[PDB]
């Protein structure tokens, strides 16, 4: 889980 | 508060009355949290993340009570497999990345 | 250092030599780096976040110096929009999200 979020 | 990085930073945050638990990310622009209904009164929003694109729902003004604080953020509303809170919150707290 | 968040954190860090833009992000529990090739000494790890899951290639013991510190750690490469300093390495860097 990785949250990047542009 | 510290955190350390060593457990994720998770912290319980109260949106318009409501508890959820969310991961407060630096890498996130904006906060998206599911699972609560924030109403009709949204703009539709299209964001995006690492695996893609996602709709989601856009909210203005919402009051948010976390860390002993009380901010009035924008909130969106959409599909995420965690709850994040962006620096568009993180910034309104005071936070800060330190080495 | 300290990174308000007003702005998107990114820094750069030499991945084995080469210079990268990484965005430092609590958010993620692991460092995804598009772009750079480490060699035959993988396994294949897929990664989730908002949008989906992608599949990366892991690494481990990585060369990293960013922020004049040296460290050895886990780097996935994909295809990532974005490059991305995980828990894994802010933790080894000593880095912290106060309030």
């Given at each position: 889980?990785?949250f990047?979020?542009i | 508060?510290?955190?350390?990085?060593?457990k994720?930073?998770?912290?319980?945050?109260?949106?318009?009355?409501?508890?959820?638990?969310?991961?407060?990310?630096?890498?996130?622009?904006?906060?998206?949290?599911?699972?609560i209904?924030?109403?009709?009164?949204?703009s539709?929003?299209?964001?995006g993340?690492?695996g893609?694109?996602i709709?989601?729902?856009?909210?203005?003004?919402?009051?948010?009570?976390?860390?002993?604080?009380?901010?009035?953020?924008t909130?969106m509303?959409?599909?995420?497999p965690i709850?994040?809170?962006?620096?568009?919150?993180?910034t309104?707290?005071?936070?800060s990345?330190?080495?």
């Amino acid at each position: 889980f990785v949250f990047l979020e542009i | 508060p510290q955190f350390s990085l060593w457990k994720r930073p998770v912290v319980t945050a109260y949106i318009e009355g409501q508890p959820v638990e969310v991961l407060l990310d630096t890498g996130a622009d904006d906060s998206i949290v599911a699972g609560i209904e924030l109403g009709n009164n949204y703009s539709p929003k299209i964001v995006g993340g690492i695996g893609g694109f996602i709709n989601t729902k856009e909210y203005k003004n919402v009051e948010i009570e976390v860390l002993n604080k009380k901010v009035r953020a924008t909130i969106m509303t959409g599909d995420t497999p965690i709850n994040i809170f962006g620096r568009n919150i993180l910034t309104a707290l005071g936070m800060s990345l330190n080495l």
